[PDB]
Amino acid sequence: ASMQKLINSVQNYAWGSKTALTELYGIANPQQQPMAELWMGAHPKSSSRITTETVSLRDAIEKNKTAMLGEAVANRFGELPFLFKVLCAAQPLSIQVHPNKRNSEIGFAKENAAGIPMDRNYKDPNHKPELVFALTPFLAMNAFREFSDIVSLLQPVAGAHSAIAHFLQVPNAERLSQLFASLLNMQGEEKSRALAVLKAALNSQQGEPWQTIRVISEYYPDDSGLFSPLLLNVVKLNPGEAMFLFAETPHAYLQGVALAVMANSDNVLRAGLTPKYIDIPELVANVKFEPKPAGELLTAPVKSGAELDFPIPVDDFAFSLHDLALQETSIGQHSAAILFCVEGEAVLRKDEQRLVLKPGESAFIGADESPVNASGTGRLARVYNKL
C-alpha cells in the first residue's frame, strides 16, 4: 500500500492526562491510565507500526532507506531524523536545556570515556532542536526574560537569596549565570529561606508569572525551579501557535496539549522541577544567558495556498499545516512524511487508494509515494524534511 496508516504507541508516564487523548480523539482508556505522549515515528524503544501483518515502521525504513526516506535524508541522517508526538501535560514537566550539536558530541564522548552506560545526560551525540504547536491552550517557559523584566520580578523576593541581591546590583549575563546556578545549588536553610520568601510573596503579588509559580508549587513545593518563572519567559500559547526551542536555552512544558516535533535525541540537561541530581557546571557551560524578548518567542508561519509553513532553522525536520476543502490539494515532499489529522476529517488519495483520517489519526508517506491528494474539512499537520 502507498499510504500507510500508523499504529502508534502511547507512553503512560505518570504526568500524562487521563482524559485529553480520549476527549480530543476518542482514544479508549477504560482503566483511566495517564496518557502522556502519543508517538508518531520510528523510535527503537517504541516504533510506530504499519499494516502490510503489522511491521515496525523502523524495520520497514531500514529495509528500504532510500525509497522510504528519500536520498537526501538517507545520505544525511541514515534514518528518519525526527520524532513526532502529541504531548498531554496534566502536570508540569522538568526544566530542560539541549546543548548544540558540537557540545552534544563532546558530551557523548566524555560520558563514553567515563563509562556511564544508561543510568546519563548524553545518550547520543545529537542536538535536540524542537518545535511545539499548541492544540489546546499551552503553558510553557521558554528562554531568559529581558534583564529589566527579571529585575522587576526579583525585587519583591530580593531577601530570598544574596545571589538575587547580587544580580540586582548589576543585572547582566555573568550575574544572571551566577544567580541561575546559585538557585539550583541551594541547600538546607539557604534553600528553605529562599523558598519561604517566595511562597510568602505569592500572597502579596498578583497575576503572572506569580500565578504560574503557584501552579507549579502544587507538584514541586521543595524545588528551586519555583524561581525560574521570574527568570524565564512564561508563555501561554493559543491553539494554532508555535514556538521553536533553541539549543542552550532553558524551557519547560507546564500545562496543556500540543504537537511536538524534535530531532532524534534522548539527551537532556535538567535545570529544575525534577527530583534528579543536576550537573550544574555542565548545565551552565551549555546555557546561553542572553535574554529573548517576548516578541521573538513565537514562530511566525508563512501561508501559501492551503499550506501554512512554520519555518524551522535546522534541517532535521519541517512542519506545516494544510487546510482541507472539498476540492483536493496535492501534498508533496522529497522526504518521508507523517500526516496527522488535527481536526475535521482528512481523505487522502494516491492513484486508486483512499485513506480516511479522523482527528488524532496519522499516516506515513514514503518519499517514493509523494504526492498525495488531500480533501475533507479541518486541518492536517505534516512533518517532513525540506532538503
UniProtKB/Swiss-Prot annotation:
Record carries keyword Transport: no
Top-level EC class as recorded in UniProt: isomerase
This enzyme's EC code(s): 5.3.1.8
Family: Belongs to the mannose-6-phosphate isomerase type 1 family.
Listed PANTHER family: MANNOSE-6-PHOSPHATE ISOMERASE (PTHR10309:SF0)
Functional summary from the UniProt entry: Involved in the conversion of glucose to GDP-L-fucose, which can be converted to L-fucose, a capsular polysaccharide.
Record protein name field: Mannose-6-phosphate isomerase
Organism whose genome encodes this protein: Salmonella typhimurium (strain LT2 / SGSC1412 / ATCC 700720)
Gene responsible for this protein: manA
